[PDB]
Write an enzyme that holds these catalytic residues in place. Structure first.
Site, PDB file in Angstrom:
ATOM      1  N   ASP A 187      43.781  35.297  44.409  1.00 24.88           N
ATOM      2  CA  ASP A 187      42.967  36.502  44.559  1.00 24.88           C
ATOM      3  C   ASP A 187      43.742  37.781  44.228  1.00 24.88           C
ATOM      4  O   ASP A 187      43.218  38.887  44.371  1.00 24.88           O
ATOM      5  CB  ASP A 187      42.374  36.562  45.979  1.00 24.88           C
ATOM      6  CG  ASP A 187      41.223  37.571  46.110  1.00 24.88           C
ATOM      7  OD1 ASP A 187      40.394  37.692  45.180  1.00 24.88           O
ATOM      8  OD2 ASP A 187      41.138  38.229  47.167  1.00 24.88           O
ATOM      9  N   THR A 203      35.176  41.819  45.821  1.00 26.48           N
ATOM     10  CA  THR A 203      34.871  40.452  45.427  1.00 26.48           C
ATOM     11  C   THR A 203      33.510  39.993  45.932  1.00 26.48           C
ATOM     12  O   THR A 203      33.177  40.175  47.101  1.00 26.48           O
ATOM     13  CB  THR A 203      35.927  39.470  45.973  1.00 26.48           C
ATOM     14  OG1 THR A 203      37.225  39.873  45.528  1.00 26.48           O
ATOM     15  CG2 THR A 203      35.640  38.045  45.494  1.00 26.48           C
ATOM     16  N   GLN A 241      35.923  34.646  39.126  1.00 27.47           N
ATOM     17  CA  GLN A 241      35.464  35.574  40.145  1.00 27.47           C
ATOM     18  C   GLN A 241      34.663  36.720  39.554  1.00 27.47           C
ATOM     19  O   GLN A 241      34.950  37.186  38.453  1.00 27.47           O
ATOM     20  CB  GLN A 241      36.656  36.161  40.923  1.00 27.47           C
ATOM     21  CG  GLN A 241      36.274  37.349  41.823  1.00 27.47           C
ATOM     22  CD  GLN A 241      37.402  37.834  42.727  1.00 27.47           C
ATOM     23  OE1 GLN A 241      37.508  39.150  42.885  1.00 27.47           O
ATOM     24  NE2 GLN A 241      38.151  37.033  43.294  1.00 27.47           N
TER      25      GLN A 241
HETATM   26  C1  LIG Z   1      50.827  51.095  46.799  1.00 23.68           C
HETATM   27  C2  LIG Z   1      49.581  50.265  47.078  1.00 23.68           C
HETATM   28  C3  LIG Z   1      49.750  48.883  46.459  1.00 23.68           C
HETATM   29  C4  LIG Z   1      48.617  48.031  47.028  1.00 23.68           C
HETATM   30  C5  LIG Z   1      49.046  47.363  48.321  1.00 23.68           C
HETATM   31  C6  LIG Z   1      47.787  46.557  48.724  1.00 23.68           C
HETATM   32  C7  LIG Z   1      47.922  45.068  48.379  1.00 23.68           C
HETATM   33  C8  LIG Z   1      46.628  44.340  48.833  1.00 23.68           C
HETATM   34  C9  LIG Z   1      45.857  44.075  47.552  1.00 23.68           C
HETATM   35  C10 LIG Z   1      44.551  43.337  47.805  1.00 23.68           C
HETATM   36  C11 LIG Z   1      43.402  44.057  47.020  1.00 23.68           C
HETATM   37  C12 LIG Z   1      42.436  42.976  46.465  1.00 23.68           C
HETATM   38  N1  LIG Z   1      41.265  43.493  45.702  1.00 23.68           N
HETATM   39  C13 LIG Z   1      41.003  42.908  44.410  1.00 23.68           C
HETATM   40  C14 LIG Z   1      40.105  42.939  46.386  1.00 23.68           C
HETATM   41  O1  LIG Z   1      41.162  44.725  45.590  1.00 23.68           O
END
Ligand SMILES: CCCCCCCCCCCC[N+](C)(C)[O-]
Ligand SMILES: CCCCCCCCCCCC[N+](C)(C)[O-]
EC number: 3.1.2.20
Lengths: 285, 285
Positions: B203, B227, B277
């Site tokens: 993911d 998602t 996805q």
């Molecule tokens: C400086 C910020 C870097 C991002 C840190 C967050 C990491 C978690 C990422 C999960 C996001 C998943 N998504 C596709 C659903 O957005």
């Protein structure tokens, strides 16, 4: 042309109660139920329980048991969610007191947003290609008169393969296939109908592609293939009265399973939908 | 090391009853629950109710509501079928008396059969590539360390992108991405664990690829991606202690949705798994 109206009638389920339908099967060859029929009917049942403006954009499904085409199928729809944008439904296909299939579909209303798509693969126009009905009728000259007559393929859809892979023989080839499809008759001017009809069509010329690298036809003796799961994403609107290219590939086969991914494109090159399916693939001696 | 130990612990669910578990949510970044956590935990739950020899080979899932990481999640497993070969299970992830996600997974015991696979796309070795953590540290050489003394390296997985797409800013680029991934510590010698860990990892660096043609990063203000569904097929065994290339593409975006397809390969070119996805993609102004 009666074939198409017979299919559309068959996909237009009989209502038993809210979110509870009954569907007939068969009729067109082979006793087991064609996977596409279940998909098409499950989609109809699902959409009947969703706000009219919300069109299916995706669905996932698993087949648990082979369906018997001599018996009707009961479709029970469960409402999973209805949000400001999406409506989700789960459909159970039942026969002989047991689930033979489950589908979960998501619906959303029309909206403009980011647009981009993969470029349509090159493929020859359908104009210069024979239909599967022509190919079958030509192969039928191999049958004795007693059998040649009774047989004949009056189909709801017309299919023109770029390369023909005979299911009765099979030859070694790369795990890629392209076929052109369109309704063999006039489809109602309702996108929802075009969608579950495409759902139906999406299960044709699909899984068998995973057998190509091994030169086996899916109808040969000792060969057994059966769908495990079938998923689809409807990216854009389309008209099944016009041609659509079904570009299929089998990226893998292992552990007695075969995997395929497909894409539907309009002749002009618009990416309309994507599909994915894995199924059992066994060679019994 | 600790980060990996923490994730593995978090994925190792607390048993409330047969087919009934409770999972804690990551402290690690972002108030909303990471989809990977749910996927990983749901797989654990499912596999606990399945015969030991039958390994998960595929799963489909839908996310219905955002998960609150400040609260635990209950996973309720339903046995759909146990046949001579396949076992199927449906997992409901519940929080606040409502399902936030559903997954249906199929399991099968190892078996010899037809083998073939797509050739691994060209990609550079992970050797000379810096990790996302390294890149972050590099780009962060500014502003008061007051905040720079809290956000740092410790992740359960090490990710080395072939091309870096900054989620904070983003730049126009073709809808393709490649990142090398491996566990940041030692994963126990149980393929089941490697599998749900890969589910977690599947993911990451996925959905955002659909934003690339539009030059937008998912952490930009007013940009919202979420998602809708996540599916995966485990084609072959693998070792997450070693490098895996996650090759992703976004073949389409339309109607405020983004669609991505991924494939995991060992450095030696073995196709290990495929993913698909679709998610919501909106720019709020
Ligand atoms: C400086 C910020 C870097 C991002 C840190 C967050 C990491 C978690 C990422 C999960 C996001 C998943 N998504 C596709 C659903 O957005
Ligand atoms: C002799 C009539 C010619 C028709 C041959 C019919 C073959 C049945 C094809 C539908 C099978 C689809 N699939 C993938 C699920 O195997």
């Amino acid at each position: 042309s009666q074939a198409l109206k017979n299919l559309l009638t068959l996909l237009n389920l009989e209502k038993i109660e809210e979110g509870l339908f009954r569907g007939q099967s068969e009729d067109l060859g082979l006793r087991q139920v064609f996977g596409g029929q279940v998909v098409g009917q499950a989609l109809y049942a699902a959409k009947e329980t969703v706000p009219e403006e919300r069109l299916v954009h995706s669905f996932h499904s698993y087949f648990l048991r082979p369906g018997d085409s001599k018996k009707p199928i009961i479709y029970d729809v469960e409402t999973l969610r209805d949000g400001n944008s999406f409506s989700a439904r789960r459909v159970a296909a039942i026969q002989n007191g047991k689930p033979i299939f489950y589908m979960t579909a998501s619906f959303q209303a029309p909206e403009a947003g980011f647009e981009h798509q993969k470029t349509m693969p090159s493929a020859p126009a359908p104009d210069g290609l024979p239909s599967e009905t022509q190919i079958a009728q030509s192969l039928a000259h191999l049958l004795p008169p007693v059998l040649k007559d009774k047989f004949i393929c009056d189909r709801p859809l017309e299919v023109r393969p770029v390369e023909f892979h005979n299911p009765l023989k099979g030859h070694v080839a790369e795990p890629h296939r392209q076929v052109w499809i369109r309704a063999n008759g006039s489809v109602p001017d309702d996108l929802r109908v075009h969608q579950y009809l495409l759902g139906y069509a999406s299960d044709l010329n699909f899984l068998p592609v995973a057998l190509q690298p091994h030169g086996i036809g899916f109808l040969e003796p000792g060969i057994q293939i059966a769908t495990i799961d079938h998923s689809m994403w409807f990216h854009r609107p389309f008209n099944l009265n016009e041609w659509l290219l079904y570009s299929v590939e089998s990226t893998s086969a292992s552990s007695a399973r075969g995997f395929v991914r497909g894409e539907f494109y309009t002749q002009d090159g618009v990416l309309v939908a994507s599909t994915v399916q894995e199924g059992v693939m066994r060679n019994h001696n």
